[PDB]
Amino acid sequence: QISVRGLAGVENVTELKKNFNRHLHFTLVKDRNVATPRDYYFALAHTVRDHLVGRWIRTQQHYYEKDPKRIYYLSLEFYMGRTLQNTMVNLALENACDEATYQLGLDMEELEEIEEDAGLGNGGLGRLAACFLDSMATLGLAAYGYGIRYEFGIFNQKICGGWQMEEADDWLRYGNPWEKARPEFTLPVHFYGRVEHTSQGAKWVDTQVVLAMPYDTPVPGYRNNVVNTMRLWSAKAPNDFNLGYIQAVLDRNLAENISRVLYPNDNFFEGKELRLKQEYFVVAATLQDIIRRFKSSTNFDAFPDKVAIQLNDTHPSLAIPELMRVLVDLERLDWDKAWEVTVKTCAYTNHTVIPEALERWPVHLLETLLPRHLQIIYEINQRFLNRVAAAFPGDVDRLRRMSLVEEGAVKRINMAHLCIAGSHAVNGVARIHSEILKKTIFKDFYELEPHKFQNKTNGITPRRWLVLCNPGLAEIIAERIGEEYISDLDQLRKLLSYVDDEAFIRDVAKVKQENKLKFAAYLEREYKVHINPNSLFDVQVKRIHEYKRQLLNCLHVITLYNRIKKEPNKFVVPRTVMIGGKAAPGYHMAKMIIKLITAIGDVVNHDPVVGDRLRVIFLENYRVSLAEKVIPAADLSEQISTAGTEASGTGNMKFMLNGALTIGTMDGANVEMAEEAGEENFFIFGMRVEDVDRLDQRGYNAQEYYDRIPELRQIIEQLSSGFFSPKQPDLFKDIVNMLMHHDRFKVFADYEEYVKCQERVSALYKNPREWTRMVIRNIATSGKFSSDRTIAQYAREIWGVEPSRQRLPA
Amino acid sequence: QISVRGLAGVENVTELKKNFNRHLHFTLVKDRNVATPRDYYFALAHTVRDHLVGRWIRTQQHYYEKDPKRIYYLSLEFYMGRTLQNTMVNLALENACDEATYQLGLDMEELEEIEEDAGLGNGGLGRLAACFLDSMATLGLAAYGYGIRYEFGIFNQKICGGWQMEEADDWLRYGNPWEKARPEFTLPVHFYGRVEHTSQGAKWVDTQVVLAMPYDTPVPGYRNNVVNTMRLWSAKAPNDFNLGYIQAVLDRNLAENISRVLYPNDNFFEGKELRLKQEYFVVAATLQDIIRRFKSSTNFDAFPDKVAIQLNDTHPSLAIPELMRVLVDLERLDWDKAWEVTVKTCAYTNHTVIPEALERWPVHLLETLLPRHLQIIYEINQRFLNRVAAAFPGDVDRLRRMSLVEEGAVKRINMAHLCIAGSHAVNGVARIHSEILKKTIFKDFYELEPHKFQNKTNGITPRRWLVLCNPGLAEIIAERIGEEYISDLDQLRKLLSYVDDEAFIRDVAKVKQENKLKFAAYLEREYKVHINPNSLFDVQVKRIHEYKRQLLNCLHVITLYNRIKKEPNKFVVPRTVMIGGKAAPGYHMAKMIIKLITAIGDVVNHDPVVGDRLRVIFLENYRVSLAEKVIPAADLSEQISTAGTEASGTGNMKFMLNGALTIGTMDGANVEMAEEAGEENFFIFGMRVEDVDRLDQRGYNAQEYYDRIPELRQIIEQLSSGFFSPKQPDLFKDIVNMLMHHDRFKVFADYEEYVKCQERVSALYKNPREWTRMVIRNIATSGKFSSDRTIAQYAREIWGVEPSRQRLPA
Ligand SMILES: *Cc1c(COP(=O)(O)O)cnc(C)c1O
Ligand SMILES: *Cc1c(COP(=O)(O)O)cnc(C)c1O
Numbered sequence A, B: 001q002i003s004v005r006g007l008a009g010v011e012n013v014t015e016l017k018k019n020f021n022r023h024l025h026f027t028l029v030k031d032r033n034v035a036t037p038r039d040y041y042f043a044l045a046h047t048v049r050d051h052l053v054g055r056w057i058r059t060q061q062h063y064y065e066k067d068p069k070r071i072y073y074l075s076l077e078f079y080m081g082r083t084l085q086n087t088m089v090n091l092a093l094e095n096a097c098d099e100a101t102y103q104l105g106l107d108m109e110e111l112e113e114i115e116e117d118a119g120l121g122n123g124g125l126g127r128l129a130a131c132f133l134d135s136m137a138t139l140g141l142a143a144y145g146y147g148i149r150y151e152f153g154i155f156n157q158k159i160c161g162g163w164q165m166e167e168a169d170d171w172l173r174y175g176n177p178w179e180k181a182r183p184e185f186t187l188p189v190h191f192y193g194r195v196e197h198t199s200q201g202a203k204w205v206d207t208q209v210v211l212a213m214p215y216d217t218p219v220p221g222y223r224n225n226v227v228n229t230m231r232l233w234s235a236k237a238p239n240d241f242n243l244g245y246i247q248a249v250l251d252r253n254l255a256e257n258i259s260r261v262l263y264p265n266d267n268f269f270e271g272k273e274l275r276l277k278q279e280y281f282v283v284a285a286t287l288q289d290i291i292r293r294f295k296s297s298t299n300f301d302a303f304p305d306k307v308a309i310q311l312n313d314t315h316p317s318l319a320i321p322e323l324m325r326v327l328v329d330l331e332r333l334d335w336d337k338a339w340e341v342t343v344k345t346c347a348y349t350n351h352t353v354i355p356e357a358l359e360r361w362p363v364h365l366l367e368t369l370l371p372r373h374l375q376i377i378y379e380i381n382q383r384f385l386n387r388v389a390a391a392f393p394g395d396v397d398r399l400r401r402m403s404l405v406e407e408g409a410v411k412r413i414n415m416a417h418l419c420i421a422g423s424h425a426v427n428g429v430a431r432i433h434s435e436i437l438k439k440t441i442f443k444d445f446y447e448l449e450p451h452k453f454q455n456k457t458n459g460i461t462p463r464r465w466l467v468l469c470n471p472g473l474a475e476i477i478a479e480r481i482g483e484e485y486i487s488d489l490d491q492l493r494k495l496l497s498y499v500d501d502e503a504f505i506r507d508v509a510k511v512k513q514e515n516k517l518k519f520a521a522y523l524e525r526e527y528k529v530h531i532n533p534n535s536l537f538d539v540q541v542k543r544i545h546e547y548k549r550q551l552l553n554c555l556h557v558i559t560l561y562n563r564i565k566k567e568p569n570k571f572v573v574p575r576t577v578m579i580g581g582k583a584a585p586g587y588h589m590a591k592m593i594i595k596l597i598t599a600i601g602d603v604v605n606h607d608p609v610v611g612d613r614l615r616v617i618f619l620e621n622y623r624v625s626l627a628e629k630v631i632p633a634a635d636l637s638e639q640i641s642t643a644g645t646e647a648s649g650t651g652n653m654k655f656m657l658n659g660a661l662t663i664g665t666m667d668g669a670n671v672e673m674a675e676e677a678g679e680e681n682f683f684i685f686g687m688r689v690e691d692v693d694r695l696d697q698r699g700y701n702a703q704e705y706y707d708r709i710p711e712l713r714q715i716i717e718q719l720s721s722g723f724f725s726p727k728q729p730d731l732f733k734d735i736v737n738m739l740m741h742h743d744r745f746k747v748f749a750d751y752e753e754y755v756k757c758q759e760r761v762s763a764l765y766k767n768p769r770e771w772t773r774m775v776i777r778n779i780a781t782s783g784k785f786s787s788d789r790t791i792a793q794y795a796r797e798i799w800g801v802e803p804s805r806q807r808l809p810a
């Protein structure tokens, strides 16, 4: 047992054991003779869950009594992952449960692997919401996460013949012990219908009704006895719905399809009606819940003083016109008063600048699905533009540029413009991203209302991303500076005074080696893949995207392969290059990239001359639980997006906290990471944002690089000739064609510097002692990237509430 | 507290209270300040449930150790109703829980009304299966009920403008505390595909797979510590199902529709594909489960010695060809051996003789959905007919009459013929019904294999239908003869020696009066309907059907009304005529009958001259929980089906056990009831089966009765002229037309005798003392109708197992 895992008290271990057996008997209705590992997992889960409800009930009662300002985080995604270990960590129960299960003759680690990941997210955006919930609870904020309880989360990825195959993520199959259905708080949501203008107000009538049933999941703070709530809505058809009798009952599945599945798109907008329904569904149910709670604390003047609503991207943007609809149509406030309240309550966070990801809903869709909201949006636009016209008289082009309504083939509503107009604060997620927002995409808005624009650099929770996934590292750190850093990561700076400590250097290197052996074993366990634990673990895990440039990584791998084949008996630092991530089902190029990666591995991993000097592994079904395993085992973190495309990135922060060195472009948070650790302790390369703009001004021509770089030319010709696809010589023609003629992310432009930088990485790896000292310099300066710092800034600069580290009673 | 309700021990009441609070806190995650009546109901349910799991686990372990012959009751319907009170009764916990909840400041009766009825049945057939499960557990048989877990049971009936409106029975909305999902025992079921004939056997290939997930519900025996299992299958699509990505996920609801809703037909066959899928789904999953259990006890010679499968009607008839398919195609037994095993294992129970209820599946449907089964059915038919031909040489018409395959417009498979051929026993559900089977419908089969035909008169469980719904009566009875009768209803005969006991007579009459006041109050509570508790409660509750003749009851009611209007100041015994029951959604005539009943009430209940002398009430949403309330309050039980149409009936037995006198035809079980109590203690009238046949031979002409009976003529003319439907004068034209020209059930033929018999009923009611003495004579002789007697006969005469009243350890 390690210190950071808590105490294994005699009384508690005894108590845990009896409750474990109690649940196995009464809850699972099983006996030790027929119980399976899954049964044991559930018995443990219910036992740990019991320890939360006491605190959960008290916390909520506490908020009712003190009535503090409530924070509502709206998101269509919450990538929670597993809950068992996280709960034990935050309740200081890990060692006791480990001991208790040990005494029952069970291996707790084995039981933990049985829990299904709660994959209600695509990647970074969804995981950020999850980290935020953890930090808000740890900082004592009266916060509530509101989303959708999808029956099916992000698909499970299978690799067949080197191609990605998707399969349903039936995560609720065996039940979810952490959630508590609250059918008593079901609320009605309206769709379609028409607007009636009467004597005293517009009325939205003849609507189709869909019920929203809430399910609550506890969110425990770190050892402070605070347990907040994440409420996810599930769609239910009313009982007189459609009420052939049989057909009417079967058609209920039509209204319930709203919460059936998560759209698997990352940084890509797909204007489908079902998606719009999901967005309104979450917003309508949530706002009714917010108002109800507010009325049970009626002059909405104090509404902004008791309520804060944070819009995670534009997905829940309809909250703005919905709040107006309720205040004007139902509460009967005058427009101006309602608008004042709405703006002071809402804040919007932008997460990307890529055009294909921006939400622009066709007017005809909103017109049919939400007629009243469209009218309100037009009125908002009308008044907003009048303000622009008054500030910039005669600037007619500005008017059309800032309009919430876009004219063209089909009229569309720019949801981002709607959010800026209706929020009192708009923030980016990394310093460089926030600056780009003010200088380009939202330049006109910044000039009109400069005070609204802010920055809030992303972060990750050190509980799940250090203590939970890397106890070995958390322990050697605690041995030197104590445990206080777990909720005050800035304290990691104290490790700087150990950079020359021969004992620490040895331990840091030891933990990393153990993590790699552990991972190298898991790889053969559940995926039969031998690898060499002595090689440098080169890892790039994140969603497959052209802007993330997994292709640039591929070009490097092929370069290393060709160089070995050219001079076989020359020494090179051994490497295991691991690439993993899911591709959106309809993203063809992304799916082709996965096939390319596996095709490269097929050639490289079976070439006798190469040996164990270079391996290429594609990490199947990358997800939160997998990240917790591979990140602690990484040596090199690949963060190579084209400058100006990755708003922030968060995987980069995870690797930095876990002892990996970073090779990357000056993009998103990478800039601040290098700034914190010192550029000499980072492997930076490639074009900066300004270099990219210069290339665009003069026109990017890939042919130029192909003509001037012999090694690059050889690679393209290998791909084109079928070297990596014998049976299908022209298999990768689309890839080559894109790279040569229409590459929006300029892979070739950064190739030379990337390869040269990779050489400097291999050089440092040859000097174990100095590699580790640089690692220590990274870990020691990763404090700024804790989501506790991020949330504290949102709290003080946007929500108007003070964070607290005070423990609530037991 | 009453004696039959158990002891309220000091220790147990204390224990119950703490566990109640424990579940309210840890299970429901609530505190006394926010808990609602529903929360309290669930806290109590989980507390009582806890007391079962100990016994449930032991019982099943016991069967594994002793390995007795297992009884499998297959049914597509199980009308269970509520479970809380029944569980308390069988565990002797009623008074303790009443006390415990009382001490917690809660009214247990109020909490019981919160439980949703488990309505997985249409009426008699489904309720019989439920009573049987109770008796099998009470008699210590190793029995298992197998069915489908419908998401939506029988629809909830709403009456609007006097018309029936149907609404979805979302019974699982708030969760089901009694069931335990067993996802670990999920089994695959195959559909469609094609048959491949290879070297060594036929193979069913290219099939569509649907998963069957089981949910187990405990079935406690009466105070014997036995807890059997009812396993219901739920449909689940495999995870690579259909695997547009989004559309593929949404289409999963197509395979899952199999267990979505119960077909609401009573005594009516509707050849829909979805229905056929449900029938095979339950059969395929169940048989795999049966075999697995059998292999874990391989020469299927002993299969019939360890397994008995009872087919509840022909709904699960595919069990016969499915068992053959498994034994021949998978286990590789020779046909003859497999057939021997199948026949010795299967037994079939017929529940009706009406032609429209008989299952005749179109060959083209089976051909596409279950190609292999169709081939097996043809082979069975081939060999069966060869046997007929050998026994009756030259009788070619017999061959075509007995064939399992019916020729005509579209070829069909007679499922009843399939069942007789493949079962070693075939039984009817009442003496007269079983005789009719041998003399008419199955005459040819009886002549070929006389030994197969038996009778097993239906019964009802005295636990739910006496102790639970009428504790007042159960108590005064126990006061005289003890409690032993609750599991040995024949002992009620001892009450015959009290027929002249002035104290008993007074108590019997007292309990009935209390029940009527209780019901008269409930009527105003949840349905705002005042009624007179002093009047005779005339009740007919059962599904709306032409053969059940609610129309004959209507004719009587109108007759009473007209007679009062003719001589207003003449005395008549006051009556409250109550009629209730659901009509199948697509049964037009049944829906018109409901409208007629409410229309009559509209006129009668508002006629000043009538006063409180006659009321006509339509009991809305008749279901099990409602039956438990109205039956104990009834004085007169209406069982007036046309002779030869009601196979048995069970509502008739419920009324007899609860102190109501019976007015009815010599049909179904009525015959045996009159025989047991003595015809002088029953109000019998109308044609006997032989009279009906005579009328058919000479041709039924309704006009004759209309021309000869003045009172009847007046009624038809009132209906025709719009007397009961002012705004819609011809509203009941279809009813009059049917009655006059195409009435298959001869309502008019029994009108005169029915009215005269009703007069004799009113005469006896005027003499309270003698009315009660006859009641005592009925209750005292109702013993034969306990389902314990029925199950004991099935056990000894069909299944080959001995029942047991031995208590299992605590
Ligand atoms: C942290 C995380 C991400 C985000 O990674 P980036 O490299 O910033 O894109 C995506 N997926 C999972 C499962 C994560 O844990
Ligand atoms: C007993 C019962 C029946 C069967 O009644 P019959 O009069 O035999 O048709 C039908 N429905 C319910 C709810 C029952 O309890």
Ligand SMILES: NC(=O)[C@]1(O)O[C@H](CO)[C@@H](O)[C@H](O)[C@H]1O
Residues within 6 Å of the ligand: A123, A124, A125, A128, A266, A267, A351, A352, A429, A458, A646, A647, A648, A649, A650, A668
């Ligand atoms: N918009 C997104 O989906 C994204 O994943 O969001 C993350 C969190 O802000 C960012 O870290 C990331 O850069 C961005 O791509």
Ligand SMILES: NC(=O)[C@]1(O)O[C@H](CO)[C@@H](O)[C@H](O)[C@H]1O
Residues within 6 Å of the ligand: B123, B124, B125, B128, B266, B267, B351, B352, B429, B458, B646, B647, B648, B649, B650, B668
């Ligand atoms: N076949 C049926 O559905 C029916 O309800 O079954 C009951 C039980 O045998 C019988 O009591 C009843 O007579 C019959 O109509």
